[PDB]
Amino acid sequence: VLEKWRNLCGVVKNPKRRFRFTANLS
């Protein structure tokens, strides 16, 4: 279980293109 964590970072750690949703309580 690593290819999933290395592929997720491409979106979870890509605020440059991603809207970035840390689910912070408004």
Describe the structure in your own words:
Belongs to the cation transport ATPase (P-type) (TC 3.A.3) family. Type IIB subfamily. Residues 1-12 are annotated as: Interaction with calmodulin. It comes from Arabidopsis thaliana. This is Calcium-transporting ATPase 2, plasma membrane-type. It is found in: Endoplasmic reticulum membrane. The protein is mostly helical and 26 residues long. The protein has one domain. It contains one helix and no strands. It has one helix spanning 3-12. It is flat and about 35 Å long. The N and C termini lie far apart (33 Å).
In summary, what is this structure?
Residues 1-12 are annotated as: Interaction with calmodulin. This protein is an all-alpha fold. The chain has one domain.
